[PDB]
């Protein structure tokens, strides 16, 4: 047995277990719960009060609730990861034993948010760093103790770099000769030409 | 099999290469594998052996990787659990030539084994150990806050195998707690050993 939403793998045993906990809700409130988890995946927060308020239908204990939110998050994220359509998802959740009405409901919510999910999942994909901003000042040097008249421009750069979302940017500040600045700008333009050939 | 339920791909690759390999070259390679297990840097000596045998680096890598895995998995087994007859039988199922099996068996069971065991036991450590422990015992006679104190304390200094070092002072009420804790753990190590010998050894 192998499944597309599992990534061409057999289903995890904890997923196959907790799919039987989904069958314990009404189909009408399984669909409402999907909307709450899917909102969180879209970055719109999560309403634990509503999740607990509706799952009282099935008299879930908090271990049931934890396992239910975890498995819905896995199914929806992993279908979107592999670009699985709701038609495939419905058919192959049924193979795992989810009731056909519960399968339906669950996939008509995926079908509505499939496209914005994948745009968010690309934004969340692993980054080492992010360039948050650039600042610069250009100076002109007139004279020095070390050279009686200089008359050369000089550049200062400050680069704001973010290591993780929700964190203040680190400034990288440095000073450059106008020769060093010229070669840096010319090299970045060559890199950009290669980048544009890929996408 | 000591190699587990499914044969590692590097071992299967190596075992088919052995049919083409001169026993002189096999025994030269085996010394490098064994000495690497003892922690000796061999990279330059392996390269010289490569050009000497006319082995391309793609085949050196396959041979060395397969020999390392076989010896690693055998040498991690106690002598109660792998023994010369069953080791020799299992290696023949890989179709390794019998003369090379004898060389491999001499490494696992011969006089090389005690030094390998010593190196393998060093790898169970994960946290640092005490490298040194020094103290002085002092009595305070007077202090800014007391014309007469007369209070003892222990100044302690630890060096750990991590290369870290700590110097700190211990109140005598805190020394009593430390001494109690250490004697208690020693009782409970000895109790655990007696559980093991009477239930896990049979």
């Amino acid at each position: 047995m192998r499944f597309r939403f599992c990534g061409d793998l057999d289903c995890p045993d904890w997923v196959l277990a907790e799919i039987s906990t989904l069958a314990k809700m009404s189909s009408v409130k399984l669909r409402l719960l999907c909307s709450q988890v899917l909102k969180e995946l879209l970055g719109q927060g999560i309403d634990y009060e509503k999740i607990l308020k509706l799952t009282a239908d099935a008299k879930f204990e908090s271990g049931d609730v934890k396992a239910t939110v975890a498995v819905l998050s896995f199914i929806l994220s992993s279908a979107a990861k592999h670009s699985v359509d709701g038609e495939s998802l419905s058919s192959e959740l049924q193979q795992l034993g989810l009731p056909k009405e519960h399968a339906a409901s669950l996939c008509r919510c995926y079908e509505e948010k499939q496209s914005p999910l994948q745009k968010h999942l690309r934004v969340c994909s692993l980054r080492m760093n992010r360039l948050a901003g650039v600042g610069w000042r250009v100076d002109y040097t007139l004279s020095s103790s070390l050279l009686q008249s200089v008359e050369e421009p000089m550049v200062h750069l400050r680069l704001e770099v973010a290591a993780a979302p929700g964190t203040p940017a680190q400034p990288v500040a440095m000073s450059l000769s106008a020769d060093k600045f010229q070669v840096l700008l010319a090299e970045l333009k060559q890199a950009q030409t290669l980048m544009s050939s890929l996408g | 099999s000591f190699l587990g339920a499914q044969l590692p791909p590097e071992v299967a690759a190596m075992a088919r290469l052995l049919g083409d390999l001169d026993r002189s070259t096999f025994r030269k390679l085996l010394k490098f594998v064994v000495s690497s297990l003892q922690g000796e840097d061999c990279r330059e000596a392996v390269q010289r052996l490569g050009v000497s045998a006319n082995l391309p680096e793609e085949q050196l890598g396959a041979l060395l990787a397969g020999m390392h895995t076989l010896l690693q998995q055998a040498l991690r087994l106690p002598p109660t659990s792998l023994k010369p007859d069953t080791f020799r039988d299992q290696l023949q199922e890989l179709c390794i030539p019998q003369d090379l099996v004898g060389d491999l068996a001499s490494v696992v069971f011969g006089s090389q084994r005690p030094l390998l065991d010593s190196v393998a036991q060093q790898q169970g450590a994960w946290l640092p150990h005490v490298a040194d422990f020094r103290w002085r015992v002092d009595v305070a006679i007077s202090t800014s806050a007391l014309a007469r104190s007369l209070q003892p304390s222990v100044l302690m200094q630890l060096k750990l195998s991590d290369g870290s070092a700590y110097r700190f002072e211990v109140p005598t009420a805190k020394f009593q707690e430390l001494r109690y804790s250490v004697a208690l753990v020693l009782k409970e190590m000895a109790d655990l050993e007696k559980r093991c010998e009477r239930r896990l050894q049979d």
């Binding site: 600042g135 000042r137 007139l142 103790s145 500040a173 | -």
Partner: protein, 190 residues
Amino acid sequence: MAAGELEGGKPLSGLLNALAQDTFHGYPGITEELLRSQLYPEVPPEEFRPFLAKMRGILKSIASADMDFNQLEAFLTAQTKKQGGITSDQAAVISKFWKSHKTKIRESLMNQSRWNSGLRGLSWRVDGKSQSRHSAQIHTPVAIIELELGKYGQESEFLCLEFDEVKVNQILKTLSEVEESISTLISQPN
């Protein structure tokens, strides 16, 4: 109705003050909803939003140019002589605001553009050396100088230096060479 229609000059002066504090002094938490509710609670937020954007974009341009009165009033006049433009009275409020704030805004932009250390203070004393552990009798004076340095938004460092009467005069002549460099450059146009 929109805030652009209203001629509340003090409310508009407050808006420009808040806009300058956010834009140039960098005070956090300044936001459209706060300015609407205090300054113009009768203006709908959607109507206030373009006036905020218009005043912000104009003010950013003025500060980057560092406009003189001819530039400032010509630019603002062109803003008056357009569809949905500001009134001449609003421009007059902006001009009065800009007169005082121009000094403060300019200096703030200098600090924002500086990320080397700056001189925060200089302090000095002169002592008579008299005796030491070994030298039973000393008399030569010495100057002790404390130099306070820091980067913008960071804690100050203090550097303390000690100078004899000779090194005091070596440094003093070095500073006189800086002044004579300046005096030449400004006299060269003669």
